[PDB]
């Protein structure tokens, strides 16, 4: 075996996909779930507004879609039949931990603000365009995790 390519490289490579996936799904979960607390709260008062109320959860589930396509891309680059470097092995853990915390943070923020955003949305109609604007600045924190990770994946191959 080459010196630059030891035999324990599949450990860190498969550490990356694991960390990229489940931490993404953690952010996507509580991003969705904490908002649904607020959604079902005012559903008792106002039956109507729910068709505008599913915008926090569909923006929450897209983080798992980010977390998936970063995980499906880096996997499949790994097989027994070819030897890949430890240098390429570490960066999948780097790519993995990068997206995993980023859209977790995006999940946290739009979880809690998506909770309180539709919470007192029953009082006024017009604050909708405001709260959907700050969700866009809140969502791109998970988009910032990917756009470096795709750059981080294409290094060392």
């Amino acid at each position: 075996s080459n010196i630059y390519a030891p035999l324990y490289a599949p450990f860190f490579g498969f550490a990356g996909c694991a960390a990229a996936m489940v931490l993404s799904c953690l952010g996507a979960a509580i991003g969705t779930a904490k908002s649904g607390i607020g959604i079902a709260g005012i559903g008792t008062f106002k039956p109507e507004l729910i068709m505008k109320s599913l915008i926090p959860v569909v923006m929450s589930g897209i983080l798992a879609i980010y977390g998936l396509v970063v995980a499906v891309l880096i996997a499949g680059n790994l097989s027994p039949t070819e030897d890949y470097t430890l240098f390429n092995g570490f960066m999948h853990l780097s790519c993995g931990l990068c997206v995993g915390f980023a859209c977790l943070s995006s999940g946290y923020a739009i979880g809690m603000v998506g909770d309180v955003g539709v919470r007192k949305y029953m009082h006024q109609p017009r604050l909708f365009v405001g709260i959907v604007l700050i969700l866009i600045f809140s969502e791109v924190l998970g988009l910032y995790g990917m756009i470096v990770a795709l750059i981080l994946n294409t290094r060392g191959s």
């Binding site: 509580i30 904490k34 607390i37 607020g38 005012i42 008792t44 008062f45 919470r119 007192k120």
Partner: protein, 344 residues
Amino acid sequence: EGVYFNIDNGFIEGVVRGYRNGLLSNNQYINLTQCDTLEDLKLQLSSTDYGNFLSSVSSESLTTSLIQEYASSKLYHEFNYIRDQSSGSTRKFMDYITYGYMIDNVALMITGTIHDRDKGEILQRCHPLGWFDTLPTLSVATDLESLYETVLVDTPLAPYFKNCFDTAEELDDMNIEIIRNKLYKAYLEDFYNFVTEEIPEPAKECMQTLLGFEADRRSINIALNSLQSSDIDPDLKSDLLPNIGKLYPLATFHLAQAQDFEGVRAALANVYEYRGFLETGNLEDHFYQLEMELCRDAFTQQFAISTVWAWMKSKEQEVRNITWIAECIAQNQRERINNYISVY
């Protein structure tokens, strides 16, 4: 977050939401509004979740007293049902809700001393939810240090008597009014302290807001009451006003130097958050309206334990509307029927 809530409080918060949506809607009262007599008030009230509780009450003998009594009674058995199942955090919380009331019980009881009124019926006129097992307090010779040993050592009101003993021989109506506001002050210090240190996270701030309001409601009401008929020192006024409301830590001292109603509008001027006393015939209307729209927000937290504290104060608010309806019908006061207030 909200994950560890349903270990204990799952069933209780589940069933209270059942008790929530059985409250009367806004068109519900309008249906009750058109009722001409009390059997009309009886049968048409049975359309809601209350009904069949007026079974076996009477054959054409109904008063506002009887209507209020059973509608209160069906709450209190049911409140003792939801207090029946609770764990350590929830139980002593819900006991603190009970401790919140029972200071009113001892105040009403010592009030019966100077009137020499009958012992047997004063607790009958009193409130059954606030209750402590040892009630000799009226029958004993009432001196505050002799009354001290019974009320303090046994009952949980032990921490709440501090620097409270002044002219212990007299027991004036005004002096027993002093000690209860001192007791309310000492209570709300403790109860705010409790939800600060030990309660879950989404149920902190909604409770802190809602309870802090009640401190503020207590504060400005006793401010007006001291203003009208009493003459005391600002340091005496500052003891009656709890600081734990914290919507105004500063204006409490500014309340203390207010000896006139122009002073108290100036004392509540610089806050500007809420307006009572703004040219309104019914001052308590503003309080109860603001209270319910707070409790409206309280039910919009799903995993809070603060739902029940909103819920109790919500349901006692509609029963006095029911009392208001039944009073206006039998005594033929038609114009003020529509002064009922409910958000739901």
